[PDB]
Symmetry: C3
Subunit: 481 residues, 3 copies
């Protein structure tokens, strides 16, 4: 098919996607505002709707305008490409200064350039997919865990690349292009050179074409490491190498060092940890040793795999915020006007908080459905929650500790709510749910039923963990994900 048809199709698809998103955004904002008005009574702020700032700078950024004229641009681009005069327009870049990632500048490109880059990247990847080394990182996690279990003592080397994209040398890339027997047409080379453009060093960040170049640069390193006989995995901006012999790990370190010099890239000293030995807890080591290793939010050890501390902190933060927002925040305003005061042993806010916590943790599944699936009465279940992102966890003690934390936090929050209500002049200590001790919370809430459905049940990590383990055993990681 002609170039124009393909360009038109890609531009149309991109515009339709962006429009769709925007529409969902404003509709959700309306629903949330409606709920907030009831929650905060007459102190609720008014609704505000915003449009992205960068849309104003150029008409091309705005999706609707591009949708209006999606034919002229395609023809002009095709003609400019045939004439070999095409050049991508300047991107919009905004820095994100932070302690981690430094400047962490991010760039966004106009819709036509992004569409062209995506099309070319897809074609190149399709033709050259076979000549490449082995969301699929989970299989690597399984392999490393199995190897770690097989022998207690393993040698590990961890390298953290710093400013990998920024320092790539164009001459090195030019050398790679001629060698390795890859298939690249003249037009593709022209487009790649056009994208590099003025930049003296480095490759553009935030573009689809860049990923292919990154894979291309590391082909020789992968071949050399495979020839050596060590095992390795590379994901994002990190690499891990493990072996059972000191000599091989030393040779791998030498190869990595020599490669960095050739390609003008530097390894951050602070982030890099160096060679170490991973051994079971309670056994001495003759060299520097560690008992746990982190990979993509997973903590791996000889005995078991557990969730990383930071993820646990985020989960605790979210649950705490939900409880605070629904129970304590509304009562600290100057005037309690428009709000509903709990009475006759009924509290709506407690129900709303419990439902939101259930949605965050499971996705809305009831305990009965999980039990039925486990027993075998039903054949299917859907996983749509925070737990889905960690399908391979096998540690039981941590989940129990988390469940205890949830129950205690709920009890303390309810007590503080009761104190504030008493301070405002209403005494509701006798009425439920303020009359229940910590030990009795689970059973009393479990028994209570509203409208024939048990909506007061406290969620438990262990039950979902059991369901996940059974699903994994009887199926595959790809099926679950």
């Amino acid at each position: 098919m002609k170039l124009e048809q393909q360009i038109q199709r890609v531009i149309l698809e991109e515009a339709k996607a962006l429009i769709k998103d925007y529409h969902e955004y404003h509709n959700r904002v309306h629903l949330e505002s409606v709920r907030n008005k009831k929650r905060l009574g007459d102190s609720a702020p008014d609704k505000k709707i915003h449009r992205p700032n960068y849309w104003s700078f150029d008409k091309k950024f705005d999706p609707f305008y591009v949708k209006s004229n999606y034919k002229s641009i395609a023809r002009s681009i095709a003609n400019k490409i045939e004439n070999r005069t095409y050049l991508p327009n300047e991107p919009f870049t905004k820095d994100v200064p932070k302690p981690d990632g430094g400047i962490r500048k991010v760039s966004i490109y106009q819709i036509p350039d992004a569409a062209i880059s995506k099309l070319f990247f897809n074609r190149l990847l399709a033709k050259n997919r076979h000549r490449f080394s082995s969301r699929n990182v989970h299989f690597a996690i399984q392999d490393i865990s199995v190897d770690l279990k097989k022998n207690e003592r393993t040698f590990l080397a961890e390298f953290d690349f710093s400013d990998f994209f920024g320092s790539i040398s164009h001459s090195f890339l030019n050398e790679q292009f001629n060698e390795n027997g890859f298939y690249i047409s003249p037009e593709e080379k022209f487009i790649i050179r056009s994208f590099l453009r003025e930049r003296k060093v480095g490759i553009p960040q935030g573009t689809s074409i860049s990923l292919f170049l990154a894979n291309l640069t590391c082909w020789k390193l992968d071949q050399d490491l495979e020839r050596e006989g060590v095992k390795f995995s590379r994901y994002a901006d990190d690499t891990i190498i493990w072996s059972q012999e000191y000599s091989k790990i030393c040779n791998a370190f030498n190869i990595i060092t020599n490669f960095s010099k050739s390609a003008g890239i530097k390894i951050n000293p602070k982030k890099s940890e160096g060679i170490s030995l991973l051994t079971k807890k309670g056994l001495p080591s003759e060299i520097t040793s560690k008992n746990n290793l982190d990979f993509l939010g997973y903590t791996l050890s000889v005995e078991n795999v557990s969730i990383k501390e930071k993820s646990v902190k985020k989960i605790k933060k979210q649950i705490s915020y939900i409880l605070y927002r629904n129970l304590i925040q509304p009562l600290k305003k100057t005037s309690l006007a428009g709000q509903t005061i709990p009475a006759n042993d009924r509290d709506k806010n407690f129900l709303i908080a419990i439902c939101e916590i259930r949605r965050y943790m499971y996705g809305g599944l009831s305990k009965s459905q999980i039990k039925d699936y486990l027993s075998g009465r039903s054949n299917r279940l859907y996983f749509k929650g925070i737990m889905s992102f960690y399908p391979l966890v096998n540690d039981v003690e941590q989940l129990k500790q988390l469940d205890g934390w949830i129950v205690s936090v709920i009890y303390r929050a309810l007590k503080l709510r009761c104190q504030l209500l008493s301070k405002w002049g209403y005494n509701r200590s006798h009425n439920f749910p303020f009359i229940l001790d910590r030990e009795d919370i689970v059973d009393k809430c479990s028994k209570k039923t509203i409208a024939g459905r048990k909506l007061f049940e406290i969620p438990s990590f262990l039950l979902i963990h059991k369901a996940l383990q059974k699903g994994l055993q009887e199926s595959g990681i790809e099926k679950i994900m």
Copy 2:
């Protein structure tokens, strides 16, 4: 010969041995009581004779009854064995709870079962003795010491098995039985299965048959280690491996780890020390290092072999107790009735104490006999003392320190005795041996002679050490032991 004759002979020998022992016990107790009556005067306690408690539980335990009827049991056992209905009776087990060894349960079996086990074990060992890897541990000590001296830097790995006997898997043993081309008759297999009996896991402790099974289980490990090329020695519940290359020691560690998993045995983390480098004192090491290694009460280092600290503590305890018992303990009783008070420059208790110390250290040999043997006037000497258990010691400084300790302790004990005697109302400061200073003790005691024999000489470790070294050089360790 028929089975009955062999069974009869073994049972008779066991009964005669036990009887003999008992008779020696009671006779010795009588002699000791007679001496105690003189030592403690009229405060001496009366003699008490006891019989082992477990004898009462069953008639078979008692030796005399079994001696009375040693024919019927043999015939019945032979018939039951031929019918394949034989089963060993339950053993008597008494726990020994302690910090070291934990429960440390010990079991004793009746005389017929023990005789049967000994007979079968002897036959099996005789037939299968050749297919086994190399009181003979002393030769191993010589070899390791020579290797340690040859090169200053050596790599060592030490593993302490925990509950080795308890956790042996029967399935693994069954697998070993079929393989390895050993010669085992049907009756032997039947007896081994009978001994295992109800036990789900583990092998009986305290029986002769168990040792053969233990050697059988470790055959593959020994073959693999020999194939690797490292050198090792296994005695009791400990193993040592040494080599001059890091790679081999790492491979040996891997082999040991893999074997433990296969045979369901665990290595105690606390007792195990891990890989280390043994180097001469005053030289730095790049990894964890040690300057001394302990083996069966021996401390081995690059420079020399010396006695372990615990053994020295036991020797000090025994010598101190003997001096206290003969010099201080009799004078702290309420009434000094029936005792003899030192007078006219003569003290019997000092003579008795010195003679007991000499018997404990040498075995009763005089200094003259040792000197004659060293010079060559005589051709033979007998070694029967505490020193005999440590025939390879070559450290001279430690022996000198011990001799100084002995002289000082003797002087202090005599001074305390003099003070107590003065407190009771007798002043004997002028009379010997209370008039001698520490420096003059050895010479004055040496010169004094009673009945034409020098009985007041103070024993010296160095002289016996010289005699032992000369005997070892002119003979062999087997001859000395």
Copy 3:
């Protein structure tokens, strides 16, 4: 040619050299005394001339007497050599007790014996020069630096021989003589045996013949190390071995240890440092690591080569002493009689101090000559100063720090001089050079000119460093040295 002619020539050359030296000594002492008389006025001490004490003990030590009768000695020596009755006379030995080097005894020999030893050593070295392994240590420094830069991680082992000369075993040397296929005539062997003479162990120190023996003893060690594949360098009483594999370094350590036992030499434990890993700063190591290594006054690291701390301390000491001697010391005497007081904005002592510092640092070269050579107006320069001894330094920061130190010390010394002059009763604060602040010292001194030559310029290390680097790049180390 006959033996007599050669002996005569060597003796004559030695005597003429020694005489020459003596004459230069006394003439220099006269000039220095003349300058001192002006510097210290009427407090100057009187001149004293001395002759070496050992000259008195024997007439042979004195050069003039040997020069008077250089013919008889040659004939007598030749006849005694032919008769095989020659024996060297006893040397004069004086101990130099110190913490470093211990007794450090040094021996001096009479002129004829030294001449004979030099002649024989030269002939033996000439014939056997080819059979030897690779002021030439600088090339080794270049090679080690290049290797260190090539790979960041390197393994190093350093051994310090102790009393190497003292403990050499004669039997070992005798064994070496027969083997290795060296060419040694009977007379040479006779002379070597004569030199060893009464000494039971060791070889004489301070004689030319000894060096050849030292090279001869280590031939086997060098061959073995080369066969192993490691790289090494031996200079004076130290050796360094470096490699990129742990196994090879361990084998080299074993070879060195085995050799020492065979040749009865010991390695000092304190001086020896053991195996270590040299890595770039800021990168972790799994074993003992260091970031800098010292060799013959040079400090070598991955980034650059810099001067050792001790040499810097000596340079600081010399510059400080020169400033103190010319500026402060003359004014602390009891009476300022015969001295010249600074007046009319002129100070001779400052000029003398600056000229002496320039002579010590450069050798007298002006800034203009260096600038002309750098630009290319002139083609040649001569290097004759302290800097010449360190021709390979490439560190710039250290030189800048040294220059700042020099300027500050000059300013402080001038201030103290002004205070002392005021204390004596003369106020010269307004007059130069006491009116200049630290910042303005360099420019004001630079501009000032006397007799058409700029003699007040402050020397700078960086300019000479640049000249040295340019000379090295455009020539060779041998040419510069």
